[PDB]
C-alpha cells in the first residue's frame, strides 16, 4: 500500500491532545530541544504510541469511580485499566504545566461538574489508576478537559504545554512513557500543530499530528518504506507547493524554518501535506521562510 | 529512585534550639521550591517555610522570626533551624520538594519520611 | 479511486452527532419510517450535506456572543454565519427531542458555564444566527454539549432523538435541511451507529456514519461507481464474515436483519465494515441474523 | 406557513364576560398544546391558560375559577372565556400552539398577532 497522509486543510482537522480545532503550525522556543507527548503519537505505519486513541472521542477524556476520596480510573469504556501496560489508560490528558478543569457528567444522572485537577500531588497517580477526587462526590462518571488555568504549583508557575505531566513515579522507566521526541539535526525543528485551548490566557495547545492524521495511519498501516517521508504543504486552491516538510517513522514531521518570524508559523493554514516519495533521512530541506 | 532524607530533630526543653536538614537524591532534572511541613495532634499538616531556588523564602505567621531556612543547591539540601522552641511547636515535620524527573515532563511533590520534634 | 472503509473497528470510533464513543449497532423503532439527521450527513464520494463538519472537534458545539438576551452565532472558528444557506452553522447540535446542556467556556477567561437549550421557543432561530441566551451574561463563548434532558416543551414527552429540532421558522422549506433518509423497502432498514449520552435517562444517540468514516470519505473523495456499496461486516481476528450491508450513495447504510431481537443489534462492535464491490441498488441481501 | 389567528376580545366592563378564539392553519404534521398568554405594557408576558390535545388544561393562579379554556381539535381552534375580569386583566392576549411541522422534526412554538383586551372601571 503506497503511503498517504489525508488530504484535508488543516484548518478542519483536529489537535490530538484536546478536542480543539486547529488555528495554527506553530515551532517550539529555542528552550524547547524535545518532547514526549503521550497522546498524539503515531507512527506512519500505523501503530499507537503511549495513551494514544484512534479516535478524538476518547481524546482529553478520563473514566472512573469516585468514592469521595479518589477517583479509580478505567479505560473510557468501562474496562479495568491494567497498570504497567501505559502512563493512563488510553485518552488521558497529557497537559503538563497547567491545572485541569475537567467537565463530569454520568450516565443515567442530570447535572455537569467542574472537576480540578492539580497535577503535582503525590496522590496524583494514574500510571497506578487513582487520582485524588478533590470534592467529586462518590459515582460513575465520564471527564473531558474543558479548560486550563496556571498551574498550582509550583505557586506562580506560567503554563507550558510542551510538558507531560508526571504520571505518579519516583523513577521515569516505571510509568512505561512513550518514548521522547528530539530534533533530528542539521537545522531541523520539530513542527507543531496549534489549537486555542479556553483559559485565563493565550493558551497554545501543541501536538505532534492532527487526530484526523492517526486514525487514517492506524486505518491505512502502510509499510514505512523509506527512511523519512518527503511531504509537500500545498494550497488546496491553487495546488502550489508552499513548503517542504520531512515526516519521519516515529510519527512526527520537521523543517528547516530559516526564521521563527518567516517560516512554517506564518504559513496559511487551509494547507494540505501531501506525499511526494521516500527519501533518505538526512535528505536536505529547502528552508520554508527567509 | 527519587527520595528525600530528612535528619535532625528530637526532645528539646522550650526556648531551646533544633536543626532540621533533609537532603534530595536519585536521578532528577531540576528542583524548584523545597520546604518543611508539620501536622501536630489533631491538626492538619501546615506548612512551617518553604524557599525557593534563587532563596526567596516564605514562612507561616506563627514561626516567623524563631525558625529559619536554607538551601544548599550544590547538594540539594534544604534546613530548616528552629530557634526559641515552645510547645506548640511539638509535631511531625516533613521535608518537601518540587522535582523534574526529566526535562519533557511537569513537576511532583515529593515528601521525606517524616520526624517528630518534640518540645517539653 | 477504489472505495475504502477505514479499517478501524467500530468500537474504537466516535458518533457523529455528538463527541462520543460508539458502544453498540441499532435499527430504528417500527414507529420511525425516515431520519433528517444534519450532521453525520456525508456522500460516498466525500460531499458533507447538512452542517456536517469533517472533524469531531466541530462536532455539536457553538460559538457566538452572548448580550445578556440573545446569543449571535458565528461559525466555529469566529466568521460570521450567513444565513439561509443551511439550517444552522457548522457542527451546530441537531438533537431534536431533547433540552441541550452545553458547556460554555471562553478564551482569555476561567470558568464554565452550563448553558441550557430549549429548541422549542420562537427566540429559538438557529438559521438566522440567534438563540436565547437564557441567562448566559455578556461575552463570547464556545460551547459543546455536555449532556441532555427529557424536553421542556411539550411538557412530559419523552426523549426522542431520532428527530432534529426545528431550526426557527415556520416553513419547513426555510431552514434548508439535509433532506430526509428513508429505509429503500423490500426487508432492508437503515443501520445506525448508536452512543451512550450522559443524562438522567438511558439514552443512546443514533447516527448514521462514526465520523472517522466522514473524514476518510470527505478526504477520499473516491467516485461512487455503481448504485450501492455491498459491505461485509468482519471480525477482524478471525476475518469471518459476520453479515453483508449495502451503503447508498447518500451515504447511509443497510441491512436485512431479519429480526430486532436476532440481528445487527446483536452484532459486536469490535467489527470492521469492508467494501466488496459495487452493486445494483436491487442486489437482495441476505439477513444478518436468524 | 403556520398561522395563528385571534379573534375576540375589546372593551368590557368590570365584573363583565368576554371570549376569545384562535384558529391554527397552515401545512403542519402535529399539534401538542394550545394557550392563551397575556402581557400588559410594561410587564413580563405571563401564562393565562393552556390546554393539551387530549383535552387537559391548566390556568395559572389569577385567572382560575374565572377563566375557561377549550378546544376543537377537527378546526385546531382554542377558546377562551373570561368571567368575573377586573382591570388587572387589561393586556394584550396572544394566543399560543405548539406544533411540529414535520415527522422528523421537533416541535416550535409559534404566536398570533395579539388581541386587545381592556376592563374599565
Ligand atoms: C476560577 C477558579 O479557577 C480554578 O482555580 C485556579 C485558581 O483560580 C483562582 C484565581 O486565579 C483568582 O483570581 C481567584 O479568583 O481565586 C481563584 C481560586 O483560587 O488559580 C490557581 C493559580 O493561582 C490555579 O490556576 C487554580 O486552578 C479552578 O480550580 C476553580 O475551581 C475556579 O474555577
Ligand atoms: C438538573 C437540571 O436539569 C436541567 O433542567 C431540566 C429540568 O430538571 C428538573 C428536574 O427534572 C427536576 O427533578 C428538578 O430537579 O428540577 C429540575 C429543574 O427544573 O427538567 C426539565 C423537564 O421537566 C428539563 O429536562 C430541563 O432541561 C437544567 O436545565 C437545569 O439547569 C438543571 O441542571
Redesign the interface.
Known sequence: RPFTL???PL?????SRA???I?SIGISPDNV????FQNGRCTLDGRLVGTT??????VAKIRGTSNGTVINLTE??GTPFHPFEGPAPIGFPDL??CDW?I?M????????T?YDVD????T?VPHLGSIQANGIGSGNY?G?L??I?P?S???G?QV?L?????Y?????EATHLAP?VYPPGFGEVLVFFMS?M?????YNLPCLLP??YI??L????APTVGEAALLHYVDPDTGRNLGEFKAYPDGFLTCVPNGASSGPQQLPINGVFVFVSWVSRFYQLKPVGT | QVQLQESGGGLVQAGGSLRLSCAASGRMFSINSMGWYRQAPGKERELVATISEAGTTTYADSVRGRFTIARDNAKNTVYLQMNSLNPEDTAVYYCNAYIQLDSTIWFRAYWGQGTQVTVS
Open positions: 489525508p488530504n484535508l484548518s478542519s482537522l483536529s489537535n478536542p480543539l480545532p488555528s530541544q524535545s518532547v514526549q486513541p484512534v479516535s478524538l472521542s476518547h473510557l469504556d503538563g504545566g478543569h467537565n457528567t454520568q450516565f443515567g444522572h442530570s447535572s455537569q467542574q497535577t503535582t500531588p503525590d496524583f465520564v473531558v474543558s479548560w488555568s498551574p504549583h509550583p505557586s508557575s507550558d510542551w510538558k507531560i505531566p508526571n505518579g513515579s519516583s523513577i521515569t521522547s486555542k479556553p483559559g485565563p490566557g493565550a487526530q484526523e486514525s487514517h492506524a486505518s491505512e498501516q
